[PDB]
Enzyme design. Sequence first.
Site, PDB file in Angstrom:
ATOM      1  N   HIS A 466       9.121 -27.680  23.397  1.00  0.00           N
ATOM      2  CA  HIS A 466       7.636 -27.987  23.683  1.00  0.00           C
ATOM      3  C   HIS A 466       7.125 -28.474  25.298  1.00  0.00           C
ATOM      4  CE1 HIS A 466       4.119 -30.798  23.108  1.00  0.00           C
ATOM      5  NE2 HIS A 466       3.635 -29.714  23.005  1.00  0.00           N
ATOM      6  N   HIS A 657       3.812 -21.587  22.190  1.00  0.00           N
ATOM      7  CA  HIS A 657       3.390 -23.025  22.256  1.00  0.00           C
ATOM      8  C   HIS A 657       2.705 -23.443  20.856  1.00  0.00           C
ATOM      9  CE1 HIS A 657       0.129 -26.136  22.940  1.00  0.00           C
ATOM     10  NE2 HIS A 657       1.123 -26.657  23.613  1.00  0.00           N
ATOM     11  N   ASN A 661       3.809 -26.569  18.724  1.00  0.00           N
ATOM     12  CA  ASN A 661       2.989 -27.694  18.820  1.00  0.00           C
ATOM     13  C   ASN A 661       2.083 -28.073  17.677  1.00  0.00           C
ATOM     14  OD1 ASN A 661       1.220 -29.375  20.911  1.00  0.00           O
ATOM     15  ND2 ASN A 661      -0.286 -28.396  19.697  1.00  0.00           N
TER      16      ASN A 661
HETATM   17 FE   LIG Z   1       1.325 -29.099  23.571  1.00  0.00          FE
END
Ligand SMILES: [Fe+2]
Length: 806
Positions: A466, A657, A661
């Site tokens: 991440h 992402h 995330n």
């Molecule tokens: Fe992030």
Amino acid sequence: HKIKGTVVLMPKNELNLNAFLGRSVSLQLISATKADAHGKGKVGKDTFLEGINTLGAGESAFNIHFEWDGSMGIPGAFYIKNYMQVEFFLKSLTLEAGTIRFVCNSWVYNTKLYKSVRIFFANHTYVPSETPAPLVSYREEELKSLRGNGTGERKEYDRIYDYDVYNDLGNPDKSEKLARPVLGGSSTFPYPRRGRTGRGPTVTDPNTEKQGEVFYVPRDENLGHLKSKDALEIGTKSLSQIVQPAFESAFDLKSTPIEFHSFQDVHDLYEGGIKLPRDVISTIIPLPVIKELYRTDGQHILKFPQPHVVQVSQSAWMTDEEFAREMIAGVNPCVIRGLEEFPPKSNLDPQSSKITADSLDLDGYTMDEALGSRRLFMLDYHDIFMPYVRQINQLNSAKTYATRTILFLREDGTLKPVAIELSLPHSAGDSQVVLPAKEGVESTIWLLAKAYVIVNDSCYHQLMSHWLNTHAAMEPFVIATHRHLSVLHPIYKLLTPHYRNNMNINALARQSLINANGIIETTFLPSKYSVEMSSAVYKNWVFTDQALPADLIKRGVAIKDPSTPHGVRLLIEDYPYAADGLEIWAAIKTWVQEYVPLYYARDDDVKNDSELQHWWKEAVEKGHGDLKDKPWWPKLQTLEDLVEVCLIIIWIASALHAAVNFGQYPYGGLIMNRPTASRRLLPEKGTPEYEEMINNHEKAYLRTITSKLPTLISLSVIEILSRHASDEVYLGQRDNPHWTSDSKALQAFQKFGNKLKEIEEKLVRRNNDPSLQGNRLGPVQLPYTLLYPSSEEGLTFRGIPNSISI
Ligand SMILES: [Fe+2]
């Protein structure tokens, strides 16, 4: 004689209207077709805002009329001077009669604060060889101002993009204990470079940047918001500096029990909530972002939202099915690898696995059958963690093993954990296998064994999959793009929407998230070794390996196969992140493939774009400079290179992402499901904690994982990170529908939009396919929606933003 115009702007407070009139604001049109003696576009007269036009948002439009005769030819740019004291946010200029559009989206400070007067171009797209002659010098002039001098402390109004190492995390002036290694600029600690701030050295250490109240980003990287609540990036700062110390004070004053005592105590968090002192509640309530994270009773009780993973069963997280499934459909679905030999091997130098083949239940398959049909997989954290275990275990209230987990792909297509190996350093200055069990003390040990693995996985997720792979890896490209590709440039227009809010969240991250004594160090296992561990992993970071098909093949979860739609066959067919990702990937690839040829007709054209070349050269040699000598960097001399670079960049920034995330709170909101830290090793027989493990498995579990106080802080931060701001711009969207005048790009981009919604329908069918339930939903019954392109605001467990925006 007089061209009608309309200026849209927002006053600073939205992020009296009459005060904008008079001689407050002056625009000057610049010609794209008629030049001066030096070949520079002709400039019109200072022209002021005349009246308010009687849209949406906190926007106001103003009329303006420009003197523009035939000698002045066609407007293609303009100067603006703000004579008011206070900055405003400039949205656009629109010239009537085709109509000429200028999309600006830029803060405009008082004219005195600028070295060069601010300039904005019309929305036409040009490679360098194609810029209107009278705009050539202006274009390159605006780039050089963007690059700045590489010196000085950067100010709020500066729009200066440049690089620096991660030397602003430690705080040695406060305490030598808060010194941290410089990450970047050496082979010992290689690291992507971040946006320079130029605050200058601390007193005790000339290698470390001094602290600042505000971490600068170039002004237009700091988006304001109509709604204060959507400034989610702000929440991390207030969490660390305001909320965290309030929580800790609640624990000093005995106002809540220091530790969780049962699993129910944890479920209470989203149920009845937690009782806290008065001044603690009154502290969080006025905070615009933080207040959205909890429900309150006004005076004493705070409750967290019910995490997705617990919304149907409260205990399904404990099943081996869910443990295994989250490795391919969880918060961190991209670390699992094919295992093509047994026992597994290390790349260190002492470390081979002690797991025996005979001890494994592979549903009646032999080990040779399993390896033969590629049904054996591994979550291997052994090599990553071994070099750090001793130091980590030397910290207080921190104890970990370097873990391997063996997975078997069952006939029904689900993953089955069949072994966990827990290793401690074998350097005599001071190593067991755990097999699955349903009952007895054996099942409790197995459960703790699972917890240690996910502590390993949580850290790797947060810091590598991440932080490093998205936020950190992306920033240098952002910097290089503003430095070297004009706002006019087609590739700037393609890529920059995918940088939205990136440098901003990252700066506030360097300030409060990954700094010494910041959120991550005080909640996650490695403590002060956290960020530097990501440096160790950066040593093995390969730009071309971030391309999804490359990633899948590299990890031995797919093989290259031309006969398949995406040119790869999944070795785990119902691998939700990978199966869904390949659609998004393919969806992005077609768009880049259609957009690029619009502007580059042949390989020479790519080679001959001086902006593109300087861009890619600086991104690699400076931006990812510690790795500039690696042979895998694309040369950017062909059409095929350009497409690949852009595609990979867009992939990381949006889908990659989003997938890693937006499942943080949905899966990790229950701390038992995703512990961020482990505090003690397995209890030995004949010890008081051993009996506790026999007699109270829940307490034994809670005493092993993240303590209650840091849990409260860690639960709050992933909740922030997991939310979609109501003004997000998703993949397949642009903030302005006139982002370019080129009708072919517009149409191409509209086709991209359509494909994304088609894909979303496809993923909906996948989630609703009853035969795919095992991996797409599992026992937690939680539909894998993390790669749905669309979402509303909030904690939705879906939606792909354009950029790394939170
Ligand atoms: Fe992030």
